[PDB]
Amino acid sequence: MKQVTAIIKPFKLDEVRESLAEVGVTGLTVTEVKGFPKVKIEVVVDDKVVEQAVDAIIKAARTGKIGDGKIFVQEVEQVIRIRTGETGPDAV
Amino acid sequence: MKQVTAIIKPFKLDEVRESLAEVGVTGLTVTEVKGFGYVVDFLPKVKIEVVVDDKVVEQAVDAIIKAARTGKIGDGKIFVQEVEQVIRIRTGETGPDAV
Amino acid sequence: MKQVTAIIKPFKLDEVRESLAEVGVTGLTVTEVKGFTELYRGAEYVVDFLPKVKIEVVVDDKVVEQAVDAIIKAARTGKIGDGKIFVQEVEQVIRIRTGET
């Protein structure tokens, strides 16, 4: 499982979340950050969908002008859902 | 060393903190974040983050579960990632001396 | 590629950022965070938060030790609560505008 992070311009949040949702990725976390105003988006997905999710972020946030932001990919060792205690892939 | 992250409901913060502290885990970092749910959409959440030695992970995870679980949708999730190095600014202690 | 993260006292941010520029690191991401009366969604709560700032930078492996060194020297006051730095691997970095990776 992977954690996909994206730092994007605030006005793209709505489009980003819509394109993610169209490939089935929900469960986003959003934080307001300052880039030296941006929005950070974090989503922990199954390895089987990282390519689709990265591409849907690039599809929606790419305006084309300077400052569209970056995306970062990192491994996640384990994911636990609190309510049930399900672990790994079925915790997504 | 492992970073333990959890995204929990806001008002479960105090309990989680106290339950961690019972298992010896302090040094929490707290960030206010949004999650997505008339059905409300934009929701308050709180992200907690702590870096622990490898052997403490299981009981750190155990303690967060005990304190936050209600058995309803919205209780949140925990993730655990690897950290390559930890440095304590004040002294320069690295690794397990730094946790 | 490494993600360097530091959690520092809030009045040290300009100084840290100046130190980092001297070793060539400039694109910082800054988050306001808390450690252990305040208002929350309109109601007063008695709490014992301390405000901190998280700084995050993603750099080339070769640059880490000089980034780390630059933060330590600028952020230290010598007091308790100075904070901590940690390093993580980043599997892939994509620039949105272009597709550079």
TrEMBL record, chain A:
GO terms for molecular function: ATP binding; enzyme regulator activity. Keywords: Nucleotide-binding, Phosphoprotein, Transcription, Transcription regulation. SUPFAM superfamilies: GlnB-like (SSF54913). InterPro entries: N-reg_PII, N-reg_PII-like_a/b, N-reg_PII/ATP_PRibTrfase_C, N-reg_PII_CS, N-reg_PII_urydylation_site. One of its GO terms (biological process) is regulation of nitrogen utilization. The keyword Nucleotide-binding applies. The keyword Transmembrane does not apply. One of its GO terms (cellular component) is cytosol. It comes from the Bacteria. Belongs to the P(II) protein family. PANTHER family: NITROGEN REGULATORY PROTEIN P-II (PTHR30115), NITROGEN REGULATORY PROTEIN P-II HOMOLOG (PTHR30115:SF11). Homotrimer. This is Nitrogen regulatory P-II protein.
